């Protein structure tokens, strides 16, 4: 749970076309190191994905930096920015089992 949320047991690595070839490659080359689990606050009612993705691209990104750097990993500012796109996806990629209606 992590308290307020559902840290789902695992989810898929997304694939995302960044609009630049090397930003696609940057993420893809890194998708192994990147999260395999994210928090989600469920869009039961609120609606637009960005509104709930707030607590994700906040607290998931924190919990995949702080808690990964703890073992001696380190994701750069760029690694983190790349992860934003993946975390907005993953949070939905999880609850998509309803929210394919929304996304």
Are 92 and 103 in contact by the 8 Å Cβ rule? The answer is yes
How is residue 2 written in tokens? 């992590």
| φ/ψ of residue 47, rounded to 5 | 115, -105
Are 96 and 11 in contact by the 8 Å Cβ rule? The answer is no
3-state SS, 5-30, equals: CEECCCCCCCCCCCCCHHHHHHHHHH
CATH of domain 1-103: 1.10.790.10
Nearest residue to 65 (alpha-carbon basis) of 55, 49, 79: 79
**Measured between alpha carbons, how far is 43 from 47 in angstroms, rounded to an integer?**
6
């Amino acid at each position: 749970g992590l308290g307020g949320y559902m840290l789902g047991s695992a989810m898929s690595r997304p694939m995302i076309h960044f609009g630049n070839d090397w930003e696609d490659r940057y993420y893809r080359e890194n998708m192994y190191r990147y999260p395999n689990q994210v928090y989600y606050r469920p869009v039961d009612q609120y609606s637009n994905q960005n509104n709930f993705v707030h607590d994700c691209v906040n607290i998931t990104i924190k919990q995949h930096t702080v808690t990964t750097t703890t073992k001696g990993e380190n994701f750069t500012e760029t690694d983190v920015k790349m992860m934003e796109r993946v975390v907005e996806q993953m949070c939905v990629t999880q609850y998509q089992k309803e929210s394919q209606a929304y996304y």
